[PDB]
């Protein structure tokens, strides 16, 4: 299968990116420095780790894949790759596997060194809850990263130049992390006798950073819909990215 | 569901002071929120709770007793008027539960009856502020 | 209802002083003469379950060492264990054991009564709505209730309109209210210990009183509740770990205008201090707010300085320095942000409380001080623990 | 047997037809040269031969199949212009990436790195490569497997003057095996020694095809005779204007004379007879000289003496 | 005497990257610098421009020092690949070089009309192709009457009509008397326009001079194809009796292989008789002369398909 | 002069940068928004320490967005090697880029603090126009100097590197270190030592950060509250007068421009 033969490239090319390895080191340092000041000073520190991995796992995903399609079109290899025995689906899906296992490893160095700083600085942490609250944490942080990976394929395929891809990937990172929730807070303060209280939990499903925190805080909705709503953000935006990539 | 003042039980604690409501004379306010009803041991303790900025924006109906149609030692649940459209008298020598004695009325002449019978002044709901509750309680339980 | 003369008291001294021997008795009993009766340790005066067991109507009675059991429970007719009439002035009830479903020591209209060293175990099955008061005091001037041990009553030491009296060194366990105060002007209470209580200290409408040195161990939902107290004094109280069962507030100041709140120790609670909007401008300086998950709750936009004479409080989460070596900190300490009061003003923001945008808004206040609402700050906070003696 | 059978295609984008009635037939060992100046007819015929586009008014038959079948592209190399690969990968890892997609054997990456002369510069990053060193890599992925058709779009940019000749030597070896290729250049002298038949096409249409002998015979073009080492310039230079030949003087003693191919013999004897040149160079009408004729044949008026 | 390089032996890091070349350039000649092995193509390119200091030797451009601003206004340098300033326009980019070189502001319209860029002028450089940037990069080289051009691959990525019009523009500037150095790598194609070549490799300048001088210093075969001849007779084999290899081609044609110093004497041997009838010559190209001189110094021939 | 002929390019090249005009309008729409919130609360010493904090986050950002690709963006673009073959020196194509990018920062803060002053004289009634002109005259001729520091920092990290993709990594490192890491390293040095590391060396560490010298200039006359200063509370413990704080800000230009020329002279 050539979806794996093009996936082995993106592992070898993504792990030598100096821009990624600075951020993945800074993600692992700050995950220790929160865990050090969460133990010396486990649900109280997994909420501060959720605010950390909402900052950086969209940033890691957009640093990897903002130049996945348009970076190959500018490099000229994209026109070369289409003349190989390869569909346009297998190029995108193979990049999604290759970029997906990078930030599936960046949470295993990220939280693998954070859970070590919890299991060795609490002395009585009751580790049977640790390997289930971090197993639900490492899976949900990867799925958050796979959304913004699929968001990065949408904005890479739309633009025609590498400089305007980073101008939109910064715009997507501003909008989906810290502008959409600020206009939620703004709506409440400006309008308090008109806005529906019930509507806001449902309106939280239009933001995958918000769905990420709701599966680390365990509410009118159940838990199982949020797993199928985070996977729906992957499956729609990858299908949207495949629909854009077939129109170049 | 905010239109319904629920009745008082004997095992009903106040929202603020937490003690038993029906062991006291005077009118007993309560606040129906339409997400959960919270009750108060005195009307002055309800108005002390209402003037906090957490509850200014809170959409909740306030209900107090009608002391123009009830005996002051044991008020029935019964007629329970809306507290915004009431006529509170202040400064009387009656012994309420917690705050100053704020006998609530609905007809304003019975409020004028108790005002001249004890030396008090009728005042509306919007004239109640936290400068007045602490002034009236100091004249009642002080000196 | 028989009398105390219907028993067999052996006189040790001929100055109306009697001594009851060891052996059980039955029924209610009444003191009508100034008898300084003592008791042997086997004097189990067990009533049958009705009426006030030991009614006292005579002045100057030194009741000592008795053991009362199973009196009535009609709280409306005040079925007490020790009923003390208004004419029974200066009664001493010393070192007694009580077990019965009503009032332990009900006094009313009395002067200079001394309720010392008793052990009053209230009930086990009644729903803490009909258990009766441990030590009920109803408008007494001069009382001295010292070093008792009240357990499992209803609302502990209830006090109604009693002017001048001391509450010294008494241990109160597993009750609804620890010490209840109703309209008790110019009161005092020292060094009391309250354990596992649904409100540690009820201070309702009592002015000019001194609350000093008291301890509150593992109470439920309210450490010290003060409603409408003026010119009071709160010095040296130790309120520790008030868990929920309210969310748990070590001190809840509601409509208290003037009072000095110094040298306290609010430890390991959910809320260190709740300051309502009506209770403003009172001297709060020198306390220790250690280990609380949220120190001050103050839902207002009015500024509130918490430091008289340049000395503030010790805060555990005070991340400050001290360059010039005095006890005071160098930077001021705001205990509340603007986003810490949006959570209280709008409870729907709890869904958004872990967002990075909220974490952005905590940093924007530290960089741009125009958006800082005027809060509950204290210039010059303390650097070290001022309550070095209360931890022992 | 023909490798590329373009049978009457007409490719358009909207209403405007960017390519009108192209009709080619590339042989089994021939070297074709697509040259285009204004229109995208060079560019669209690249994408039509590959599976990048679809013929909107015709069909192409690459190796007797549709151009987007997987059996076609496993035996088809293609070098694009100004390609830059993944700069963090190595030179050898890029070919081992491209060998997996074309189905090539892994015992060919060591040969093809040696066959283009990258054995010394392998296992270093692509970002520390030259412009010409990337063309050695880009040619190497076109030779993966056993290709039957190569589309070299400008293969000799940035290359050494020796290495561009060894590339064509590697090219002329390959067409002897039976791999018919296509050169697509703009530097027109330099490809004329290795082209088999040109395919000079205009803005829209296909102007003329055939070998160099057929294009020189169809398009009557003059002949250049460069004479170096003469006595004086203007003794001859004023005379060729009277004989009817545009002649210039290139140095202190060297001229070139543009004859008209009936005058070429009698003008040749006037140099060896009259005067003594040190060397005589005779230039045939080149591929570049044929190219500017065909642009004049359809639009495209010639500029000034020195303008562009 | 435009460029007078005399005894320059450039070193950096004690590595002697350039080695004792003496390259004198005429005042109207068009030189060609071709270098592959060493850095001699690029170090000597900088040394003329004055931005490199000649260790152990002197360089004299236009009879003066190479770094005086009085002669740096009289040069024009076209670099390798110049994406200039992608936000500016075409006119504002060239006016920016018009102020810097000190030329008159009226030349910016007569050069953007000269180079075919006036339709693409007043448009941003990010929408320019590689052909238009080379078109623009030439326009700053012709700014304010340069007495010494210096082009480093001017025809890269440029359409083949305008490549020929570039050299006719180059040929106009030679007759005006401005020497031009063509530093290129596409040597079949520039050999019709230069006047003297300078092949330098492994630091040392291997060969210099005109094209006929390089063929004189390198005994190489020529193909003299002469169709339309006499009786296909002893006339065919008589140059085999002269010491050559005359192929008696069938269609009344001879293909003689000569030694190119005996070139024209075999020519007037043939055309001195009355039946040449439109013969053809095939001299060795600059491509083949490059590979001889490179192999003569350090290079060995590669394999059959090794590069 | 040649320094002005190359300044006219950069003055006309930075103004076509769309990323500049976004975040210089962001500096304008925030300096009105801070001054509007400072007008609705009245207050005065909090809107000075917040406006000086706004130009701490943005005037290093506009300066590093301009000039991170000033030398190395011309080197890999090919147009630097051509420029040395023009009648110029390396000192004129650096000082000219500093003048050309410096007038943009002199205009990007004249727009920002210009409309911020007009959002005070037209918003808060009865403000002192003498005190307003003096405070915002001190803001204009000190936020350019903070901008010209980070302009001269960007020429150091452009001449040192040889690839433009790595210059943006260093410019992000300089922006994070001087703006919001050095105030936090100094904070973490004071909390963990409880102010007992050095009671006399620690106020002198504010001079090793030009963003803190910028805050010390504008917060001279308006101290007001204490916690709003935060880590600037050591500024009372600095014995230097106000004129040295201007001169230590100019010395941050002149050392980091002479370093920028000495790096560029051996490029
Ligand atoms: Cu009470
Ligand atoms: Mg200090
Ligand atoms: Zn109440």
PDB file of C-alpha atoms in Angstrom, chain C residues 16-219:
ATOM      1  CA  UNK C  16     -28.279  23.518 104.059  1.00  0.00           C
ATOM      2  CA  UNK C  17     -25.604  21.315 102.477  1.00  0.00           C
ATOM      3  CA  UNK C  18     -26.617  17.804 101.472  1.00  0.00           C
ATOM      4  CA  UNK C  19     -24.986  14.758  99.884  1.00  0.00           C
ATOM      5  CA  UNK C  20     -26.929  12.200  97.913  1.00  0.00           C
ATOM      6  CA  UNK C  21     -25.555   8.644  98.200  1.00  0.00           C
ATOM      7  CA  UNK C  22     -24.970   6.206  95.373  1.00  0.00           C
ATOM      8  CA  UNK C  23     -28.099   4.578  93.998  1.00  0.00           C
ATOM      9  CA  UNK C  24     -30.638   5.212  91.284  1.00  0.00           C
ATOM     10  CA  UNK C  25     -33.836   7.219  91.581  1.00  0.00           C
ATOM     11  CA  UNK C  26     -37.009   7.801  89.585  1.00  0.00           C
ATOM     12  CA  UNK C  27     -39.159  10.671  88.368  1.00  0.00           C
ATOM     13  CA  UNK C  28     -38.832  14.418  88.192  1.00  0.00           C
ATOM     14  CA  UNK C  29     -37.384  16.423  91.069  1.00  0.00           C
ATOM     15  CA  UNK C  30     -37.696  20.004  92.260  1.00  0.00           C
ATOM     16  CA  UNK C  31     -35.436  22.327  94.266  1.00  0.00           C
ATOM     17  CA  UNK C  32     -37.353  24.942  96.243  1.00  0.00           C
ATOM     18  CA  UNK C  33     -34.773  25.688  99.003  1.00  0.00           C
ATOM     19  CA  UNK C  34     -31.118  26.831  98.774  1.00  0.00           C
ATOM     20  CA  UNK C  35     -29.586  23.343  99.068  1.00  0.00           C
ATOM     21  CA  UNK C  36     -25.891  22.885  98.293  1.00  0.00           C
ATOM     22  CA  UNK C  37     -26.338  19.272  97.295  1.00  0.00           C
ATOM     23  CA  UNK C  38     -23.376  17.160  96.220  1.00  0.00           C
ATOM     24  CA  UNK C  39     -23.483  13.628  94.869  1.00  0.00           C
ATOM     25  CA  UNK C  40     -21.656  10.332  94.954  1.00  0.00           C
ATOM     26  CA  UNK C  41     -20.620   8.940  91.519  1.00  0.00           C
ATOM     27  CA  UNK C  42     -23.397   6.320  91.628  1.00  0.00           C
ATOM     28  CA  UNK C  43     -26.171   8.925  91.849  1.00  0.00           C
ATOM     29  CA  UNK C  44     -27.986   8.097  88.613  1.00  0.00           C
ATOM     30  CA  UNK C  45     -31.071  10.290  88.856  1.00  0.00           C
ATOM     31  CA  UNK C  46     -32.945   8.644  86.003  1.00  0.00           C
ATOM     32  CA  UNK C  47     -36.332  10.095  85.171  1.00  0.00           C
ATOM     33  CA  UNK C  48     -38.875   8.035  83.282  1.00  0.00           C
ATOM     34  CA  UNK C  49     -38.914  10.107  80.097  1.00  0.00           C
ATOM     35  CA  UNK C  50     -41.348  12.921  80.858  1.00  0.00           C
ATOM     36  CA  UNK C  51     -41.106  16.338  82.449  1.00  0.00           C
ATOM     37  CA  UNK C  52     -38.174  18.455  83.506  1.00  0.00           C
ATOM     38  CA  UNK C  53     -35.950  16.171  85.560  1.00  0.00           C
ATOM     39  CA  UNK C  54     -34.278  18.641  87.930  1.00  0.00           C
ATOM     40  CA  UNK C  55     -36.252  21.860  88.196  1.00  0.00           C
ATOM     41  CA  UNK C  56     -34.600  24.626  90.207  1.00  0.00           C
ATOM     42  CA  UNK C  57     -36.480  27.618  91.594  1.00  0.00           C
ATOM     43  CA  UNK C  58     -34.361  28.695  94.561  1.00  0.00           C
ATOM     44  CA  UNK C  59     -31.373  31.061  94.593  1.00  0.00           C
ATOM     45  CA  UNK C  60     -27.812  30.068  95.604  1.00  0.00           C
ATOM     46  CA  UNK C  61     -27.825  26.349  94.824  1.00  0.00           C
ATOM     47  CA  UNK C  62     -24.518  24.521  94.339  1.00  0.00           C
ATOM     48  CA  UNK C  63     -25.640  21.439  92.438  1.00  0.00           C
ATOM     49  CA  UNK C  64     -22.552  19.281  92.055  1.00  0.00           C
ATOM     50  CA  UNK C  65     -21.728  15.838  90.741  1.00  0.00           C
ATOM     51  CA  UNK C  66     -25.225  14.619  89.851  1.00  0.00           C
ATOM     52  CA  UNK C  67     -25.953  12.309  86.911  1.00  0.00           C
ATOM     53  CA  UNK C  68     -29.295  12.862  85.189  1.00  0.00           C
ATOM     54  CA  UNK C  69     -30.844  10.459  82.699  1.00  0.00           C
ATOM     55  CA  UNK C  70     -33.803  10.355  80.289  1.00  0.00           C
ATOM     56  CA  UNK C  71     -35.974  13.386  80.889  1.00  0.00           C
ATOM     57  CA  UNK C  72     -38.810  14.585  78.666  1.00  0.00           C
ATOM     58  CA  UNK C  73     -38.716  15.826  75.106  1.00  0.00           C
ATOM     59  CA  UNK C  74     -41.545  18.390  74.825  1.00  0.00           C
ATOM     60  CA  UNK C  75     -39.557  21.409  73.695  1.00  0.00           C
ATOM     61  CA  UNK C  76     -42.649  23.633  73.752  1.00  0.00           C
ATOM     62  CA  UNK C  77     -43.159  23.056  77.476  1.00  0.00           C
ATOM     63  CA  UNK C  78     -39.318  23.102  77.793  1.00  0.00           C
ATOM     64  CA  UNK C  79     -38.706  19.619  79.156  1.00  0.00           C
ATOM     65  CA  UNK C  80     -35.142  20.189  80.261  1.00  0.00           C
ATOM     66  CA  UNK C  81     -32.717  18.322  82.433  1.00  0.00           C
ATOM     67  CA  UNK C  82     -31.836  21.351  84.566  1.00  0.00           C
ATOM     68  CA  UNK C  83     -34.569  23.975  84.450  1.00  0.00           C
ATOM     69  CA  UNK C  84     -33.566  27.145  86.270  1.00  0.00           C
ATOM     70  CA  UNK C  85     -36.288  29.659  87.122  1.00  0.00           C
ATOM     71  CA  UNK C  86     -35.805  33.469  87.052  1.00  0.00           C
ATOM     72  CA  UNK C  87     -35.945  33.488  90.857  1.00  0.00           C
ATOM     73  CA  UNK C  88     -33.093  30.940  91.025  1.00  0.00           C
ATOM     74  CA  UNK C  89     -30.299  33.488  90.857  1.00  0.00           C
ATOM     75  CA  UNK C  90     -26.592  32.447  91.091  1.00  0.00           C
ATOM     76  CA  UNK C  91     -27.049  28.726  90.517  1.00  0.00           C
ATOM     77  CA  UNK C  92     -24.005  26.505  90.072  1.00  0.00           C
ATOM     78  CA  UNK C  93     -24.368  23.320  88.026  1.00  0.00           C
ATOM     79  CA  UNK C  94     -20.959  21.670  88.354  1.00  0.00           C
ATOM     80  CA  UNK C  95     -19.583  18.465  86.772  1.00  0.00           C
ATOM     81  CA  UNK C  96     -22.678  16.584  85.666  1.00  0.00           C
ATOM     82  CA  UNK C  97     -23.463  13.796  83.211  1.00  0.00           C
ATOM     83  CA  UNK C  98     -26.665  14.047  81.169  1.00  0.00           C
ATOM     84  CA  UNK C  99     -28.361  11.826  78.597  1.00  0.00           C
ATOM     85  CA  UNK C 100     -31.855  12.698  77.441  1.00  0.00           C
ATOM     86  CA  UNK C 101     -33.775  13.980  74.444  1.00  0.00           C
ATOM     87  CA  UNK C 102     -34.490  17.566  75.501  1.00  0.00           C
ATOM     88  CA  UNK C 103     -32.737  20.646  76.819  1.00  0.00           C
ATOM     89  CA  UNK C 104     -29.611  19.994  78.797  1.00  0.00           C
ATOM     90  CA  UNK C 105     -29.375  23.217  80.788  1.00  0.00           C
ATOM     91  CA  UNK C 106     -32.312  25.523  80.141  1.00  0.00           C
ATOM     92  CA  UNK C 107     -32.016  28.801  82.018  1.00  0.00           C
ATOM     93  CA  UNK C 108     -34.166  31.903  81.577  1.00  0.00           C
ATOM     94  CA  UNK C 109     -34.295  35.259  83.355  1.00  0.00           C
ATOM     95  CA  UNK C 110     -31.458  34.248  85.703  1.00  0.00           C
ATOM     96  CA  UNK C 111     -28.428  36.145  86.950  1.00  0.00           C
ATOM     97  CA  UNK C 112     -24.839  35.001  87.606  1.00  0.00           C
ATOM     98  CA  UNK C 113     -25.466  31.315  86.961  1.00  0.00           C
ATOM     99  CA  UNK C 114     -22.363  29.192  86.546  1.00  0.00           C
ATOM    100  CA  UNK C 115     -22.626  26.113  84.341  1.00  0.00           C
ATOM    101  CA  UNK C 116     -19.235  24.486  84.798  1.00  0.00           C
ATOM    102  CA  UNK C 117     -17.621  21.266  83.625  1.00  0.00           C
ATOM    103  CA  UNK C 118     -20.671  19.270  82.581  1.00  0.00           C
ATOM    104  CA  UNK C 119     -20.991  16.516  79.993  1.00  0.00           C
ATOM    105  CA  UNK C 120     -24.292  16.711  78.111  1.00  0.00           C
ATOM    106  CA  UNK C 121     -24.757  13.935  75.550  1.00  0.00           C
ATOM    107  CA  UNK C 122     -27.966  14.785  73.713  1.00  0.00           C
ATOM    108  CA  UNK C 123     -29.381  12.154  71.364  1.00  0.00           C
ATOM    109  CA  UNK C 124     -28.676   9.735  68.555  1.00  0.00           C
ATOM    110  CA  UNK C 125     -31.812   9.179  66.470  1.00  0.00           C
ATOM    111  CA  UNK C 126     -33.775  12.424  66.318  1.00  0.00           C
ATOM    112  CA  UNK C 127     -33.237  14.399  63.105  1.00  0.00           C
ATOM    113  CA  UNK C 128     -31.498  17.458  64.760  1.00  0.00           C
ATOM    114  CA  UNK C 129     -34.766  19.367  64.607  1.00  0.00           C
ATOM    115  CA  UNK C 130     -36.242  18.208  67.921  1.00  0.00           C
ATOM    116  CA  UNK C 131     -33.140  17.303  69.931  1.00  0.00           C
ATOM    117  CA  UNK C 132     -33.272  20.430  72.054  1.00  0.00           C
ATOM    118  CA  UNK C 133     -30.482  22.774  72.969  1.00  0.00           C
ATOM    119  CA  UNK C 134     -27.384  21.752  74.832  1.00  0.00           C
ATOM    120  CA  UNK C 135     -27.020  24.831  77.045  1.00  0.00           C
ATOM    121  CA  UNK C 136     -29.934  27.188  76.405  1.00  0.00           C
ATOM    122  CA  UNK C 137     -29.542  30.678  77.863  1.00  0.00           C
ATOM    123  CA  UNK C 138     -32.524  33.023  77.578  1.00  0.00           C
ATOM    124  CA  UNK C 139     -31.810  36.693  78.488  1.00  0.00           C
ATOM    125  CA  UNK C 140     -29.427  36.244  81.404  1.00  0.00           C
ATOM    126  CA  UNK C 141     -27.049  38.877  82.744  1.00  0.00           C
ATOM    127  CA  UNK C 142     -23.918  37.661  84.495  1.00  0.00           C
ATOM    128  CA  UNK C 143     -23.662  34.010  83.396  1.00  0.00           C
ATOM    129  CA  UNK C 144     -20.456  31.957  83.408  1.00  0.00           C
ATOM    130  CA  UNK C 145     -20.639  28.806  81.306  1.00  0.00           C
ATOM    131  CA  UNK C 146     -17.207  27.186  81.377  1.00  0.00           C
ATOM    132  CA  UNK C 147     -15.485  24.037  80.104  1.00  0.00           C
ATOM    133  CA  UNK C 148     -18.498  21.865  79.336  1.00  0.00           C
ATOM    134  CA  UNK C 149     -18.696  18.959  76.890  1.00  0.00           C
ATOM    135  CA  UNK C 150     -21.834  19.056  74.745  1.00  0.00           C
ATOM    136  CA  UNK C 151     -22.372  16.243  72.257  1.00  0.00           C
ATOM    137  CA  UNK C 152     -25.163  15.482  69.759  1.00  0.00           C
ATOM    138  CA  UNK C 153     -27.706  18.082  70.850  1.00  0.00           C
ATOM    139  CA  UNK C 154     -29.517  20.503  68.543  1.00  0.00           C
ATOM    140  CA  UNK C 155     -27.657  23.800  67.870  1.00  0.00           C
ATOM    141  CA  UNK C 156     -25.182  23.487  70.753  1.00  0.00           C
ATOM    142  CA  UNK C 157     -25.150  26.443  73.104  1.00  0.00           C
ATOM    143  CA  UNK C 158     -28.166  28.489  72.097  1.00  0.00           C
ATOM    144  CA  UNK C 159     -28.108  32.004  73.499  1.00  0.00           C
ATOM    145  CA  UNK C 160     -30.988  34.472  73.244  1.00  0.00           C
ATOM    146  CA  UNK C 161     -30.699  38.166  74.293  1.00  0.00           C
ATOM    147  CA  UNK C 162     -28.269  37.493  77.162  1.00  0.00           C
ATOM    148  CA  UNK C 163     -26.083  40.500  77.795  1.00  0.00           C
ATOM    149  CA  UNK C 164     -22.924  39.801  79.748  1.00  0.00           C
ATOM    150  CA  UNK C 165     -21.534  36.266  79.909  1.00  0.00           C
ATOM    151  CA  UNK C 166     -18.428  34.204  79.187  1.00  0.00           C
ATOM    152  CA  UNK C 167     -18.140  30.923  77.267  1.00  0.00           C
ATOM    153  CA  UNK C 168     -14.722  29.538  78.175  1.00  0.00           C
ATOM    154  CA  UNK C 169     -13.087  26.337  77.072  1.00  0.00           C
ATOM    155  CA  UNK C 170     -16.035  24.103  76.223  1.00  0.00           C
ATOM    156  CA  UNK C 171     -15.866  21.308  73.654  1.00  0.00           C
ATOM    157  CA  UNK C 172     -18.857  20.937  71.330  1.00  0.00           C
ATOM    158  CA  UNK C 173     -19.032  17.881  69.056  1.00  0.00           C
ATOM    159  CA  UNK C 174     -21.398  16.472  66.373  1.00  0.00           C
ATOM    160  CA  UNK C 175     -24.145  19.077  66.602  1.00  0.00           C
ATOM    161  CA  UNK C 176     -25.940  21.374  64.094  1.00  0.00           C
ATOM    162  CA  UNK C 177     -24.722  24.752  65.368  1.00  0.00           C
ATOM    163  CA  UNK C 178     -21.731  25.104  67.613  1.00  0.00           C
ATOM    164  CA  UNK C 179     -22.530  28.313  69.456  1.00  0.00           C
ATOM    165  CA  UNK C 180     -25.692  30.190  68.535  1.00  0.00           C
ATOM    166  CA  UNK C 181     -26.021  33.882  69.338  1.00  0.00           C
ATOM    167  CA  UNK C 182     -29.276  35.814  69.096  1.00  0.00           C
ATOM    168  CA  UNK C 183     -29.291  39.530  70.044  1.00  0.00           C
ATOM    169  CA  UNK C 184     -26.596  39.042  72.708  1.00  0.00           C
ATOM    170  CA  UNK C 185     -25.178  42.536  73.125  1.00  0.00           C
ATOM    171  CA  UNK C 186     -21.778  42.902  74.903  1.00  0.00           C
ATOM    172  CA  UNK C 187     -21.067  39.177  75.017  1.00  0.00           C
ATOM    173  CA  UNK C 188     -17.754  37.237  75.182  1.00  0.00           C
ATOM    174  CA  UNK C 189     -16.561  33.721  74.348  1.00  0.00           C
ATOM    175  CA  UNK C 190     -13.018  32.367  74.690  1.00  0.00           C
ATOM    176  CA  UNK C 191     -11.088  29.253  73.598  1.00  0.00           C
ATOM    177  CA  UNK C 192     -14.049  27.059  72.607  1.00  0.00           C
ATOM    178  CA  UNK C 193     -13.540  23.976  70.446  1.00  0.00           C
ATOM    179  CA  UNK C 194     -16.150  22.976  67.866  1.00  0.00           C
ATOM    180  CA  UNK C 195     -15.932  19.681  65.964  1.00  0.00           C
ATOM    181  CA  UNK C 196     -17.908  18.283  62.984  1.00  0.00           C
ATOM    182  CA  UNK C 197     -20.694  20.828  62.985  1.00  0.00           C
ATOM    183  CA  UNK C 198     -23.101  22.088  60.323  1.00  0.00           C
ATOM    184  CA  UNK C 199     -22.152  25.676  61.318  1.00  0.00           C
ATOM    185  CA  UNK C 200     -19.305  26.316  63.738  1.00  0.00           C
ATOM    186  CA  UNK C 201     -20.307  29.696  65.170  1.00  0.00           C
ATOM    187  CA  UNK C 202     -23.604  31.449  64.519  1.00  0.00           C
ATOM    188  CA  UNK C 203     -23.237  35.145  65.270  1.00  0.00           C
ATOM    189  CA  UNK C 204     -26.681  36.561  64.561  1.00  0.00           C
ATOM    190  CA  UNK C 205     -27.522  40.189  65.423  1.00  0.00           C
ATOM    191  CA  UNK C 206     -25.327  40.415  68.491  1.00  0.00           C
ATOM    192  CA  UNK C 207     -23.297  43.566  68.797  1.00  0.00           C
ATOM    193  CA  UNK C 208     -20.243  44.663  70.799  1.00  0.00           C
ATOM    194  CA  UNK C 209     -19.001  41.147  71.577  1.00  0.00           C
ATOM    195  CA  UNK C 210     -15.569  39.528  71.766  1.00  0.00           C
ATOM    196  CA  UNK C 211     -14.861  36.239  69.948  1.00  0.00           C
ATOM    197  CA  UNK C 212     -11.346  35.134  70.817  1.00  0.00           C
ATOM    198  CA  UNK C 213      -9.152  32.055  70.548  1.00  0.00           C
ATOM    199  CA  UNK C 214     -11.840  29.646  69.391  1.00  0.00           C
ATOM    200  CA  UNK C 215     -11.137  26.550  67.320  1.00  0.00           C
ATOM    201  CA  UNK C 216     -13.237  24.924  64.597  1.00  0.00           C
ATOM    202  CA  UNK C 217     -12.114  21.439  63.541  1.00  0.00           C
ATOM    203  CA  UNK C 218     -13.664  19.878  60.384  1.00  0.00           C
ATOM    204  CA  UNK C 219     -17.032  21.617  60.430  1.00  0.00           C
TER     205      UNK C 219
END
